[PDB]
């Protein structure tokens with residue numbers, strides 16, 4: 001099965017993985033770990049016993065100062081993979097932000113637009129994405145492409161429903177239910193909302209569809 | 219099958235409001251299966267027997283067929299056909315036969331109606347209807363496997379995948395208030411009514 | 415009482431033009447007023463003719479009212495459709511807006527046709543011992559698909575199948591005449607009959623079968639009444655035709671009284687078992703005959 | 708050291724056209740081999756579609772559709788290239804080229820024949836009037852393509868596309884139609900939208916620019932802020948047919964004199980401008 005990420009960043013030597021967890025419930029533990037078959041814990045934070053960094057990450061990673069940004073000092077080729085920033089609280093249980101680290105050459109930020117939407121601040125921006133050539137569509141996702149990172153805003157799996165909670169610091173009105181998944185709304189739009197908004201559609205054989213919409217706020 | 223369903227009554231009226239398009243040629247009222255009435259803007263109105271003593275009209279883009287003392291025999295499908303240049307033929311089919319649930323409102327706003335399905339079964343057909351105690355009018359019809367709205371009010375709806383359950387009503391007036399029924403077809407069927 | 419008279423089916427051809435006849439029959443006793451003519455597909459109007467405004471078409475330079483004219487009684491709603499397409503095949507409603515008789519309409523089924531091109535060829539086989547295609551009959555780009563039937567006294571079972579033709583809507587019908595190959599069927603012909611609505615007569619295509627088999631040799635000319643000159647003949651058949659004829663005996667070479675003269679053996683005035691070895695591209699086959707003097 | 712069959716992995720052929728499937732047997736300089744037969748077969752088919760014997764010559768399943776272009780009697784069989792006349796959609800598949808050699812044995816190679824059709828690209832304007840709901844304003848058609856062509860758009864306006872596939876005039880081909888839906892406005896009138904069509908048969912993607920056309924009522928404006936003169940200018944498509952001056956009460960006061968767009972005031976004004984779409988007014992307190 002596919003690994004769902006919330007943020008995608010390129011590989012770097014002084015690479016930092018941002019994780020700003022909300023102040024909610026009875027805080028139990030905050031931890032970093034590399035997603036894989038083998039147990040690979042990086043750092044574990046206790047609200048009473050402080051921070052503990054496991055080997056062989058003890059000489060590669062560090063922290064500064066609700067923000068758990070994981071900084072790296074000379075990262076190796078092997079550090080390319082999926083990272084998790086998990087927050088354990090009562091009575092919620094688990095909060096997880098998955099960060100994907102990709103190769104410097106494989107990461108693309110300079111992508112061309114298809115439509116340019118101009119909107120006044122405070123209004124609701126409605127973004128639509130309809131299948132053009134391929135049908136039945138299995139998955140639909142919305143992304144905000146920045147020059148140094150890509151953030152997953154929405155994700156809907158229509159063939160077999162999956163768990164997706166956006167860790168984006170902005171409210172996005174969306175519904176994965178049948179007859180509602182094509183339209184996503186950004187309510188009370190700010191000047192900071194300006195950027196590239198890519199839509200990705202996945203089919204059965206593997207044929208994909210991309211629709212990039214550029215937003216500009218006055 | 220029909221655009222408006224009206225229950226049987228002694229002094230029942232079959233509403234037919236056609237759009238003011240092109241040049242009017244002839245307006246016709248006939249039972250699907252006898253010809254009731256024919257209107258010509260040049261020749262005039264002609265009502266046929268035995269409907270001559272049963273039906274009447276009140277008078278400009280409206281052709282409602284009224285009944286004096288309708289009998290149980292007058293049960294079936296009625297057609298209100300409009301012949302215009304250069305559009306051609308326009309037709310409104312009506313049928314005569316013998317719950318509040320959700321509630322949702324400022325005037326002149328874009329009111330959105332959503333049909334949330336409870337059943338997991340894949341939806342093949344969706345139809346929206348306006349329910350009144352005297353008549354049930356079909357708003358929009360959508361078939362996701364393989365129609366023109368006869369309703370005088372403008373309703374924006376998309377038939378494409380991922381938008382079929384949403385219908386918007388732009389610039390809502392006082393007359394738009396009432397019951398809005400949604401029907402979903404797979405096999406299995408679901409019904410949802412919304413108050414306005 | 416007024417009735418619309420029009421044929422039930424109208425056949426047309428791809429890229430060609432066709433007229434859809436439709437006229438209003440009015441009895442000499444009744445008076446009518448036709449104010450409009452309408453043409454529409456099943457189930458948006460295609461062609462409209464008004465009593466004062468004249469004609470109006472949805473398609474440019476494709477539809478035309480062949481008889482309707484302004485200042486003349488609207489009775490013939492006959493419409494000509496130019497450059498027919500497979501998408502045009504369907505049921506069309508011809509309507510007459512009459513007063514005070516009301517609207518009178520009829521339905522005409524427009525059928526789009528395509529003349530198929532027929533070819534037939536042999537399938538060169540060998541003695542496989544299993545049923546294989548021995549003849550081929552093809553009918554390309556036909557709408558509707560053509561009917562292919564085989565006529566033979568040899569037997570066989572056909573395998574007719576169809577694939578879409580060059581133009582979308584046309585069908586290419588391919589029929590293989592399957593039979594277990596034998597020496598007896600070689601050279602003999604099989605006919606293929608192609609039947610289609612566009613043909614003036616069904617097309618007949620003849621195909622001669624080809625079977626590759628080694629020689630089938632037999633010696634004749636011995637009436638079993640030899641007493642102390644007669645000629646023996648080596649009767650052989652093969653495809654391809656024989657390349658050699660060799661006469662010998664089980665003991666070895668031919669005796670001085672037995673003289674070989676091609677495919678024949680002359681006996682001059684004893685017990686010998688003569689052999690005739692006949693060769694072709696497939697191989698050599700022998701036949702033995704016991705002669706007594 | 709060993710005999711190898713030189714042939715491409717895939718061969719792109721065009722529908723209606725004739726293609727040659729290249730298949731040659733490379734024999735080392737001093738190596739001696741005896742090729743006695745060439746065979747062509749389809750993956751899944753019951754038998755062979757083309758056979759060439761060193762002394763018996765060729766045998767074809769479809770003798771008027773197939774030909775051995777480089778195989779002849781009285782010559783060493785080294786080139787088994789086969790020409791296919793009048794390409795059909797049913798001819799798309801994997802083919803096997805065989806060389807019966809001695810004492811090395813049979814040598815085979817698989818070639819994937821792909822039947823293509825170069826689509827014809829057309830782009831036209833969808834002229835429309837002012838409406839609240841979004842309607843098509845541009846059309847991009849890629850007629851009869853195999854495989855169906857990919858149509859994308861580039862705009863400086865926020866318009867969503869609708870694409871619909873309908874079969875072309877030839878079987879196996881697809882006419883791809885793409886509409887550019889956007890809510891009309893006076894701003895997009897004259898502004899251009901580019902359509903990009905991508906296909907395997909093209910040298911590079913084809914770009915088609917389309918100028919947008921909107922039919923809108925007048926956008927009335929008055930200039931000129933003791934005698935003075937005011938001019939009435941309005942933007943519409945088609946251009947205004949008539950201009951009229953009046954007041955909130957009714958007819959013009961005794962000091963104001965007007966003729967169409969120009970108004971003279973001597974020591975609240977309304978300007979009614981009309982076109983084919985309708986009439987619009989502009990209130991101005993003086």
Ligand SMILES: *[C@@H]1O[C@H](CO[C@@H]2O[C@@H](C)[C@@H](O)[C@@H](O)[C@@H]2O)[C@@H](O[C@@H]2O[C@H](CO)[C@@H](O[C@@H]3O[C@H](CO)[C@@H](O)[C@H](O[C@H]4O[C@H](CO)[C@@H](O)[C@H](O)[C@@H]4O)[C@@H]3O)[C@H](O)[C@H]2NC(C)=O)[C@H](O)[C@H]1NC(C)=O
Pocket residue numbers: 456503504505521523
């Ligand atoms: C043009 O119109 C003809 C006639 O149809 C008639 O007009 C239509 C507009 C509509 O109002 C119809 O209701 C009306 O009959 C079309 O021909 C008809 O084709 C349908 C199939 O598409 C036939 O329907 C039946 O379907 C049954 C399964 O549900 C099936 O069992 C029937 O088969 C039996 O009957 C046929 C002979 O009719 C016989 O050959 C079979 O062996 C079997 O017993 C049948 O298929 C209608 O019967 C057809 N009617 C006629 C008169 O042929 C035509 O398809 C249409 N053309 C286009 C392109 O749309």
Ligand SMILES: *[C@@H]1O[C@H](CO[C@@H]2O[C@@H](C)[C@@H](O)[C@@H](O)[C@@H]2O)[C@@H](O[C@@H]2O[C@H](CO)[C@@H](O[C@@H]3O[C@H](CO)[C@@H](O)[C@H](O)[C@@H]3O)[C@H](O)[C@H]2NC(C)=O)[C@H](O)[C@H]1NC(C)=O
Pocket residue numbers: 573574575576588590749750751752753768
């Ligand atoms: C009766 O005839 C049909 C038609 O197929 C014929 O096959 C050859 C003999 C040709 O020379 C033609 O005359 C004609 O096309 C037979 O059905 C077909 O069987 C074949 C296998 O033999 C199937 O082929 C496959 O096709 C798919 C793609 O569609 C490929 O991916 C496969 O690799 C493989 O090639 C084919 O699907 C099937 N149907 C058609 C319409 O082609 C049928 O077997 C035959 N019956 C008898 C008893 O002889």
Ligand SMILES: *[C@@H]1O[C@H](CO[C@@H]2O[C@@H](C)[C@@H](O)[C@@H](O)[C@@H]2O)[C@@H](O[C@@H]2O[C@H](CO)[C@@H](O[C@@H]3O[C@H](CO)[C@@H](O)[C@H](O)[C@@H]3O)[C@H](O)[C@H]2NC(C)=O)[C@H](O)[C@H]1NC(C)=O
Pocket residue numbers: 205206799800801819
């Ligand atoms: C002609 O042949 C090609 C090539 O297919 C294959 O080529 C070899 C490498 C062997 O694997 C052969 O057994 C076989 O002929 C056909 O294309 C191929 O189609 C298949 C599906 O039928 C593809 O397989 C899968 O593809 C998915 C998606 O890419 C993968 O996730 C799977 O792991 C699996 O590989 C195959 O990739 C594809 N090949 C190419 C190069 O695209 C082709 O369909 C065939 N033509 C006809 C008409 O039969």
Ligand SMILES: *[C@@H]1O[C@H](CO)[C@@H](O[C@@H]2O[C@H](CO)[C@@H](O)[C@H](O)[C@H]2NC(C)=O)[C@H](O)[C@H]1NC(C)=O
Pocket residue numbers: 603620621622
């Ligand atoms: C099938 O074989 C027969 C006999 O060989 C062919 O008939 C001869 O055809 C020629 C045509 O050039 C005529 O001039 C002769 O009169 C025919 N008869 C004879 C006895 O020679 C027939 O044409 C062959 N058919 C096919 C399609 O090959």
Ligand SMILES: *[C@@H]1O[C@H](CO)[C@@H](O)[C@H](O)[C@H]1NC(C)=O
Pocket residue numbers: 013014
């Ligand atoms: C991080 O890396 C860049 C380039 O690799 C380097 O120039 C810069 O000094 C570094 N910044 C910090 C804050 O470490």
Ligand SMILES: *[C@@H]1O[C@H](CO)[C@@H](O)[C@H](O)[C@H]1NC(C)=O
Pocket residue numbers: 018020064065067068069
């Ligand atoms: C999290 O902390 C790092 C380091 O102090 C800082 O660069 C980053 O901006 C912080 N994130 C937020 C959202 O404050």
Ligand SMILES: *[C@@H]1O[C@H](CO)[C@@H](O)[C@H](O)[C@H]1NC(C)=O
Pocket residue numbers: 004005094095096097098163164165166
């Ligand atoms: C999966 O569910 C957990 C809560 O149980 C949530 O924290 C996490 O973000 C979800 N995964 C994704 C990819 O959103």
Ligand SMILES: *[C@@H]1O[C@H](CO)[C@@H](O)[C@H](O)[C@H]1NC(C)=O
Pocket residue numbers: 123124173185187
């Ligand atoms: C859309 O805008 C209105 C502005 O009044 C706001 O009330 C509404 O909540 C917005 N829609 C959504 C989905 O947030």
Ligand SMILES: *[C@@H]1O[C@H](CO)[C@@H](O)[C@H](O)[C@H]1NC(C)=O
Pocket residue numbers: 235276277280281282370
């Ligand atoms: C049509 O006319 C009748 C009689 O005047 C009236 O009751 C009905 O409401 C009219 N319809 C509309 C939509 O005005």
Ligand SMILES: *[C@@H]1O[C@H](CO)[C@@H](O)[C@H](O)[C@H]1NC(C)=O
Pocket residue numbers: 433435437480481490492
């Ligand atoms: C006019 O109608 C007659 C039948 O009454 C028909 O034979 C004739 O072909 C029609 N005219 C044309 C031009 O089709």
Ligand SMILES: *[C@@H]1O[C@H](CO)[C@@H](O)[C@H](O)[C@H]1NC(C)=O
Pocket residue numbers: 658660691692693698700
């Ligand atoms: C028949 O003739 C061929 C060719 O001359 C020869 O090779 C073969 O040995 C002969 N067969 C017999 C049994 O003599």
Ligand SMILES: *[C@@H]1O[C@H](CO)[C@@H](O)[C@H](O)[C@H]1NC(C)=O
Pocket residue numbers: 727729730731776777786788
């Ligand atoms: C094989 O034949 C083809 C077609 O005649 C030709 O193009 C090709 O050059 C030949 N290959 C060799 C190596 O001779």
Ligand SMILES: *[C@@H]1O[C@H](CO)[C@@H](O)[C@H](O)[C@H]1NC(C)=O
Pocket residue numbers: 328388839840
């Ligand atoms: C309401 O709908 C109309 C028509 O679609 C549109 O012009 C208007 O901008 C919409 N208003 C809002 C606030 O979305």
Ligand SMILES: *[C@@H]1O[C@H](CO)[C@@H](O)[C@H](O)[C@H]1NC(C)=O
Pocket residue numbers: 378843869870871872886
């Ligand atoms: C939208 O796309 C569908 C195909 O998915 C097509 O049939 C329909 O005509 C299109 N609608 C509009 C309004 O462009």
Ligand SMILES: *[C@@H]1O[C@H](CO)[C@@H](O)[C@H](O)[C@H]1NC(C)=O
Pocket residue numbers: 898899916
């Ligand atoms: C499209 O319009 C822009 C200005 O909005 C202009 O720079 C560009 O050259 C135009 N392109 C064409 C081909 O007219």
Ligand SMILES: *[C@@H]1O[C@H](CO)[C@@H](O)[C@H](O)[C@H]1NC(C)=O
Pocket residue numbers: 953979981986988
């Ligand atoms: C504007 O002019 C038109 C055409 O003469 C007229 O119908 C309309 O009533 C006028 N409006 C005003 C406010 O004078």
